[PDB]
Scaffold this active site. Structure first.
Site, PDB file in Angstrom:
ATOM      1  N   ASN A  35       0.796  -1.202   0.000  1.00 51.58           N
ATOM      2  CA  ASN A  35       0.000   0.000   0.000  1.00 51.58           C
ATOM      3  C   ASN A  35       0.841   1.271   0.000  1.00 51.58           C
ATOM      4  O   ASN A  35       0.321   2.360   0.164  1.00 51.58           O
ATOM      5  CB  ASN A  35      -1.026  -0.049   1.131  1.00 51.58           C
ATOM      6  CG  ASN A  35      -1.963  -1.264   1.007  1.00 51.58           C
ATOM      7  OD1 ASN A  35      -1.964  -2.166   1.856  1.00 51.58           O
ATOM      8  ND2 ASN A  35      -2.719  -1.311  -0.079  1.00 51.58           N
ATOM      9  N   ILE A  53       1.137   6.695   0.477  1.00 50.34           N
ATOM     10  CA  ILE A  53       0.424   5.636   1.216  1.00 50.34           C
ATOM     11  C   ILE A  53      -1.043   5.595   0.831  1.00 50.34           C
ATOM     12  O   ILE A  53      -1.689   6.638   0.697  1.00 50.34           O
ATOM     13  CB  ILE A  53       0.460   5.891   2.730  1.00 50.34           C
ATOM     14  CG1 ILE A  53       1.882   5.833   3.264  1.00 50.34           C
ATOM     15  CG2 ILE A  53      -0.433   4.921   3.473  1.00 50.34           C
ATOM     16  CD1 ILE A  53       1.995   6.438   4.672  1.00 50.34           C
ATOM     17  N   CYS A  54      -1.583   4.392   0.665  1.00 50.13           N
ATOM     18  CA  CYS A  54      -3.010   4.267   0.510  1.00 50.13           C
ATOM     19  C   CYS A  54      -3.593   3.762   1.812  1.00 50.13           C
ATOM     20  O   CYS A  54      -3.420   2.608   2.161  1.00 50.13           O
ATOM     21  CB  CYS A  54      -3.360   3.317  -0.622  1.00 50.13           C
ATOM     22  SG  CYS A  54      -5.145   3.326  -0.947  1.00 50.13           S
ATOM     23  N   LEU A  55      -4.294   4.631   2.522  1.00 44.06           N
ATOM     24  CA  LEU A  55      -4.864   4.288   3.819  1.00 44.06           C
ATOM     25  C   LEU A  55      -6.300   4.740   3.782  1.00 44.06           C
ATOM     26  O   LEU A  55      -6.576   5.880   3.451  1.00 44.06           O
ATOM     27  CB  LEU A  55      -4.103   4.998   4.942  1.00 44.06           C
ATOM     28  CG  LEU A  55      -4.582   4.912   6.387  1.00 44.06           C
ATOM     29  CD1 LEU A  55      -4.648   3.468   6.918  1.00 44.06           C
ATOM     30  CD2 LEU A  55      -3.673   5.770   7.244  1.00 44.06           C
ATOM     31  N   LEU A 106      -0.689  -0.171  -4.108  1.00 41.26           N
ATOM     32  CA  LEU A 106       0.133   0.873  -4.690  1.00 41.26           C
ATOM     33  C   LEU A 106       1.387   0.243  -5.283  1.00 41.26           C
ATOM     34  O   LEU A 106       1.901   0.728  -6.291  1.00 41.26           O
ATOM     35  CB  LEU A 106       0.465   1.969  -3.675  1.00 41.26           C
ATOM     36  CG  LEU A 106      -0.557   3.104  -3.541  1.00 41.26           C
ATOM     37  CD1 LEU A 106      -0.028   4.235  -2.655  1.00 41.26           C
ATOM     38  CD2 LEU A 106      -0.941   3.650  -4.910  1.00 41.26           C
TER      39      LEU A 106
END
Lengths: 117, 166
Positions: free
Chosen positions: B93, B101-103, B137
């Site tokens: 991610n 960051i993919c959060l 990601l």
């Protein structure tokens, strides 16, 4: 002088080469062991030589080919050395986008030559 | 607002210093998780940095990561923008080369003005325990874990982290 960064796919035939691994353990090498196609664990001496200089993290065990070729992609080392005869297309069509120099050889002189520079 | 953002962030600054100043796990639930969290330069509370430690039983164990936090002038109505340093981690991610960051809790639909920096840094830490490699990601690290190759996943991450200390 300058050896090139290497990704080395450790199938049986490559594990069998007479290579003094203590000599290259320090270099930017990665050893990808295909547990799928090896009859078990990698040879003791090899693990012992990386271990002796604390380069043990350069040995990576791979439970699958897909997983292994994902490692090759992500690390991007200059050379990629393998013997596709221990697996029989073997090398994904993709690999040349991430890697500069692929050696896929059957011949002992060629494999030793590119590993030892 | 740049008014209510600033007072909110000054409240948080106090809570943060008080929280992280303790080695008692009831006042400080973040011991060994968030090592430090402070604004990079005290004249500018819009930019912060944090250090977390890798969660146990993951290949991030026993390594620290520095995280950058940008507070937009519309906080806490919008979430902060949070990222890692470039070429500092490898995670499904995270886009390694940019640290992006993919959060999920940072997305418009899901964000609550109730969550604070502590909750955002903790959630980033939580992400190293619990990846979501289905919309990744990092599509090569994503492909490993989506093939169950746990040996390659732990090996590549440890390879990467060890070689980063060098």
């Amino acid at each position: 002088k300058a050896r090139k960064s290497k990704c080395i796919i450790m199938s049986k035939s490559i594990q069998g080469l007479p290579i003094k691994w203590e000599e290259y353990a320090a270099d930017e090498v990665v050893l990808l062991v295909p547990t799928s196609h090896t009859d078990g664990s990698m040879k003791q001496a090899i693990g012992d030589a990386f271990r002796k200089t604390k380069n043990e993290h350069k040995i990576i065990y791979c439970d699958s080919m897909d997983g292994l070729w994902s490692c090759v992609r992500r690390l991007g080392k200059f050379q990629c050395i393998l013997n596709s005869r221990d697996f029989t297309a073997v090398v994904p069509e993709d690999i040349g986008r991430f890697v500069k120099f692929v050696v896929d050889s059957d011949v002992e002189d060629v494999l030793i030559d590119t590993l030892c520079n | 607002m740049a008014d209510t953002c600033m007072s909110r962030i000054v409240k948080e600054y106090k809570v943060i210093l008080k929280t992280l100043a303790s080695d008692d796990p009831i006042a400080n639930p973040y011991r060994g998780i968030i090592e430090s969290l402070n604004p990079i330069d005290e004249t500018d509370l819009s930019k912060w940095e944090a250090i977390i430690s890798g969660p146990s039983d993951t290949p991030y164990e026993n390594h620290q990561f520095r995280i950058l936090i940008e507070v937009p002038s519309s906080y806490p109505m919008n979430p902060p923008k949070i990222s890692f340093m470039q070429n500092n981690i490898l995670h499904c991610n995270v886009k390694s080369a940019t640290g992006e960051i993919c959060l999920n809790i940072l997305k418009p639909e899901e964000w609550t003005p109730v969550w604070d920096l502590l909750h955002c840094v903790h959630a980033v830490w939580r992400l190293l325990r619990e990846p979501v490699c289905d919309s990744p990601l990092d599509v090569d690290i994503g492909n490993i874990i989506r093939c169950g190759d746990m040996s390659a996943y732990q090996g590549i991450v440890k390879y990467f982290l060890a070689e980063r200390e060098r």
